[PDB]
Design a binder for these strands. Structure first.
Ligand SMILES: [Mg+2]
Ligand SMILES: [Mg+2]
Ligand SMILES: [Mg+2]
Ligand SMILES: [Mg+2]
Ligand SMILES: [Mg+2]
Ligand SMILES: [Mg+2]
Ligand SMILES: [Mg+2]
Ligand SMILES: [Mg+2]
Ligand SMILES: [Mg+2]
Ligand SMILES: [Mg+2]
Ligand SMILES: [Mg+2]
Ligand SMILES: [Mg+2]
Ligand SMILES: [Mg+2]
Ligand SMILES: [Mg+2]
Ligand SMILES: [Mg+2]
Ligand SMILES: [Mg+2]
Ligand SMILES: [Mg+2]
Ligand SMILES: [Mg+2]
Ligand SMILES: [Mg+2]
Ligand SMILES: [Mg+2]
Ligand SMILES: [Mg+2]
Ligand SMILES: [Mg+2]
Ligand SMILES: [Mg+2]
Ligand SMILES: [Mg+2]
Ligand SMILES: [Mg+2]
Ligand SMILES: [Mg+2]
Ligand SMILES: [Zn+2]
Lengths: 98, 73, 220, 51, 97
RNA sequence: UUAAAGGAAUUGACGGAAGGGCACCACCAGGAGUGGAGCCUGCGGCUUAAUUUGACUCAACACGGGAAACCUCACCCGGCCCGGACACGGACAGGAUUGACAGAUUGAUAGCUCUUUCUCGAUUCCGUGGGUGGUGGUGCAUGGCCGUUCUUAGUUGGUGGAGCGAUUUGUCUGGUUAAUUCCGAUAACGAACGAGACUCUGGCAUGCUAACUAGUUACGCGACCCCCGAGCGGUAACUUCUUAGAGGGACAAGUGGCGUUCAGCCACCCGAGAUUGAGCAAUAACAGGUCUGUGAUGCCCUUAGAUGUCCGGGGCUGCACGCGCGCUACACUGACUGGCUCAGCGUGUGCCUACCCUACGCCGGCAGGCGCGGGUAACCCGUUGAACCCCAUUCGUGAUGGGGAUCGGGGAUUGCAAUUAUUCCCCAUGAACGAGGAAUUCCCAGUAAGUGCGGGUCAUAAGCUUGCGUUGAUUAAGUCCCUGCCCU
RNA sequence: UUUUUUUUUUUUUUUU
């Protein structure tokens, strides 16, 4: 019922890079939408981000077909759960301003 | 409308698969207390058979990962 | 290696404006969101977000505007920081009807009976330079039957052309345990001949003349 | 597994609204995809006028 | 080198065209006039109602597409200066060499 | 035995009550019809495994932009899937969780189930809860929207008088207007919405603007005609036609008559036009319709053998019937065959997620095919060589050659699939129908009507609908009987 | 000159 093992770490890598995840509601069965950022199509994106929005790790917004994923400071407190793996790096939204 | 449903039962409870194995599965044979004997056949090299073995069957030889099938008369 | 027709590029731009605006009103409903002006430049695309609380837009470190700057890039494919977002402080809060209905919503969620909230927003709008205003609230209020409520203060135009640049329509939904409440706020902007306050064309009915000229005119 | 058959490259199934994933009421083709129900909501944004 | 101004409304079209002519004619630039391409009208007609009850009542939506062509035969170095104008957001510019 | 009966008085509504008006969803004078036939397509009723369902006077019935081969699809019949988020807890397999070859099985090449046993690497799985999803119910729980009351002129408050009050007076005796439109009178005073004013379009126009993505005149070259400086079409300046911006131009202004100092009406000159078509559109409502447009939504219902979801068929089309919107017709003012001849909206490809328009040449009788070329468009299709009409031929009052349904055989073309529906074409078959009873609809000038084209749906695609044109009448310019509305 | 009838109950009220 799982993804491949590279899939979870890759999609959390994309979230830890940008801080913004975006997909659409088209659930993989009548047609095959692929994210332009990754290889895995869209179903596993949904199943990965629903675990975050359920536990409260990543907030959710919906628009016209699409999901946008939003990140709070509580979201950063559970970006610490991703920071289990690498050294201390903030995703490049919060950190600096020129 | 106001339709009402029920089970006619001409199709009983067919269970989903309950995977059956032994308690553990012992594969490797030691000869002379230190020499390795392998009882079962190995898959050919299509980036599967290096550490993945075949299945035994009445006539078939099945590869687990990449579904390579050999069979001989 | 890409171009489309002039007939379809305008309607694609319009669907882009509508998508952007209603995503910003679906997730910026917390503070006072008024609108956008989207400027295009062949090096950079600016998005001006007319909003009320720019403190809530900047946030902690300048965080939310940069997050939504990444958001707008990651679906429309304008990379490398080509799209730049800015927020602007709306000076007349009570003049934007979209802002005032959005201010009415968060009061009407947490208690705050409909009479007190509606008279409070009407006195504020009428104090804020408005010539006339109308607030209509429909929904399950104090019963099972849908008793609609109307509130009119001053001077309202309904027919003719200059509705479309005198009357600012605001239509919003409120979810409560009773169900839903539909609100309609429409505010007739005052005629100011110069500036950003109201429209610059006068009413065709309201005709201004000049006061008398002179007096002395006798021969030498 | 067979989740997807039935090529769906054309016809009524391939037509999907851009606003609420509707397919039943017909969807136009001017570079635009709507319902005709939510088009009236959004014509004032996308820039159509009656006259 | 020609410039195509395709705009959303007529007043901003006329104002950016007048600004371009005023910023053009002080130089020694031979200018071809603001030629008026004919108006395209994209029409959409709508049933107005989610369910089919009542009198048959139709919307009639229009957009007017306006287009002006201006020819400025020159070296392209001057055209780079001509491009730099604080332009109205409802106007689209094409340049063609 | 019953909780009212009743009295005055106010506002609605209504009146086969009176006054004053208005409207072709009303009439008169007329036109085209519809209702009669065939056919297309909705609805009721049957049949059905299901023939999914909403709407039932205007204010439902070519409506859900509902033109379905499956998808759509909500209904049957059968087979898979978890997308069971997430907590706590159970086994925790001393790591074994799912994926699958082959064989049986099943429509299936579904590891669905059984035989068989390799793989899979801490997401599972089992359960207690919660939750998710729903074209399920409830439009009489609701928002949004739409329609209608209501295409008529109506509607409301502040202060003040009247009355205990409900309310009224403003909002009116009269004149006038499409109009609560104005003039006037006046216990009312100033006001506001609506109508107009406003926006688009139409018509006129400057010799303003100005044009190699539009032209024109000249000037050439150039082909033919006669040959006589001519004539027809191929390749220097000016905007009249082509496009579109600013501006102007029409106001009852001028005359006369009817008019109370009036408000205004009638007739006429001049003009391009003495006013065209729309849009928007009040206060208050319907217990109008939509939960099947929505991630707009309350509550209920169902949630793993699912009302979620795919997947394969079938179906909404099935016919002793009645009804509605329509198309083709009933022929000589016509059909057939040839020739001649002029349009306007607007549409067209690598599109925010899946998509063309066609020029040329050659093959084929036609539907069509093959190469080649253009068009992201005032550039190419396309000086959109349209139909109607016009000229010539044949047919000659005959169910005739009008009529073209019924249906036999074949041929292209889309598509994953046309069979119990595609569509197009060829040959054959050749019915009813003789201008339509009771009744009813629509309509005043580029109008009804004949006719073709473009768009929406789409792949295939119009008899539908929505815009465009093209040819182009008859009879009104009036009333309140009939239908219905507004004011005392 | 006509011209009659057309189930039955569904309708509750505020602070400044
Ligand atoms: Mg309402
Ligand atoms: Mg009495
Ligand atoms: Mg008559
Ligand atoms: Mg007929
Ligand atoms: Mg008939
Ligand atoms: Mg039925
Ligand atoms: Mg209702
Ligand atoms: Mg209903
Ligand atoms: Mg309602
Ligand atoms: Mg009802
Ligand atoms: Mg009194
Ligand atoms: Mg009164
Ligand atoms: Mg001209
Ligand atoms: Mg009204
Ligand atoms: Mg829904
Ligand atoms: Mg049907
Ligand atoms: Mg019939
Ligand atoms: Mg009808
Ligand atoms: Mg014939
Ligand atoms: Mg015959
Ligand atoms: Mg009739
Ligand atoms: Mg005919
Ligand atoms: Mg068509
Ligand atoms: Mg088409
Ligand atoms: Mg239709
Ligand atoms: Mg009786
Ligand atoms: Zn939608």
């Amino acid at each position: 019922m799982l993804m491949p093992k590279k899939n979870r770490i890759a999609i959390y890598e994309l979230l830890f890079k940008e801080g913004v995840m975006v997909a659409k509601k088209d659930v993989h069965m009548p047609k095959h939408p692929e994210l332009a950022d990754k290889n895995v199509p869209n179903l596993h994106v949904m199943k990965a981000m629903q675990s975050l929005k359920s536990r409260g790790y990543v907030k959710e917004q919906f628009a016209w077909r699409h999901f946008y994923w939003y990140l709070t400071n509580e979201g950063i407190q559970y970006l610490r759960d991703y920071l289990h793996l690498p050294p201390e790096i903030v995703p490049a939204t919060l950190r600096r301003s020129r | 409308k106001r339709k009402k449903k029920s089970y006619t039962t001409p199709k009983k409870n067919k269970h989903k698969r309950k995977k059956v194995k032994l308690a553990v599965l012992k594969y490797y044979k030691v000869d002379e207390n230190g020499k390795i004997s392998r009882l079962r056949r190995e898959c050919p090299s299509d980036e599967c058979g290096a550490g993945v073995f075949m299945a035994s069957h009445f006539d078939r030889h099945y590869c687990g990962k990449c579904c390579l099938t050999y069979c001989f008369n | 290696a890409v171009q489309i027709s002039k007939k379809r590029k305008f309607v694609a731009d319009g669907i882009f404006k509508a998508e952007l605006n209603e995503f910003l009103t679906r997730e910026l409903a917390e503070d006072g969101y008024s609108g956008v002006e989207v400027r295009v430049t062949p090096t950079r695309t600016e998005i001006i977000i007319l909003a009320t609380r720019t403190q809530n837009v900047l946030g902690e470190k300048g965080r939310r505007i940069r997050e939504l700057t990444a958001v707008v890039q990651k679906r429309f494919g304008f990379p490398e920081g080509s799209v730049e977002l800015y927020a602007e402080k709306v000076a007349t809060r009570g003049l934007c009807a979209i802002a005032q209905a959005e201010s009415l919503r968060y009061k009407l969620l947490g208690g705050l009976a409909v009479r007190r909230a509606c008279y409070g927003v009407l006195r504020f709008i009428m104090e804020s330079g408005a010539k006339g205003c109308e607030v209509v609230v429909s929904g399950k209020l104090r019963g099972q039957r849908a008793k609609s409520m109307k509130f009119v203060d001053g001077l309202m135009i309904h027919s003719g052309d200059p509705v479309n640049y005198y009357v600012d329509t605001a239509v919003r939904h409120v979810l409560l345990r009773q169900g839903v409440l539909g609100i309609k706020v429409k505010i007739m902007l005052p005629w100011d001949p110069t500036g950003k306050i109201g429209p610059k064309k006068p009413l065709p009915d309201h005709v201004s003349i000049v006061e008398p000229k002179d007096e002395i005119l006798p021969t030498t | 597994q067979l989740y997807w058959s039935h090529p769906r490259k054309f016809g009524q199934g391939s037509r999907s609204c851009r606003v609420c994933s509707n397919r039943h009421g017909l969807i136009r083709k001017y570079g635009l995809n709507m319902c005709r129900q939510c088009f009236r909501q959004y014509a004032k944004d996308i820039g159509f006028i009656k006259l | 080198i020609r410039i195509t101004l395709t705009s959303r409304n007529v007043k901003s079209l006329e104002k950016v065209c007048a600004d371009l002519i005023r910023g053009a004619k002080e130089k020694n630039l031979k200018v071809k006039g603001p030629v008026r391409m004919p108006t395209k009208t994209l029409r959409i007609t709508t049933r107005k109602t989610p369910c089919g009850e009542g009198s048959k009542t139709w919307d009639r939506f229009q957009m007017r597409i306006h287009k002006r062509l201006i020819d400025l035969h020159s070296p392209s170095e001057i055209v780079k200066q001509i491009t730099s104008i604080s332009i109205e957001p409802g106007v689209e510019v094409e340049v063609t060499i």
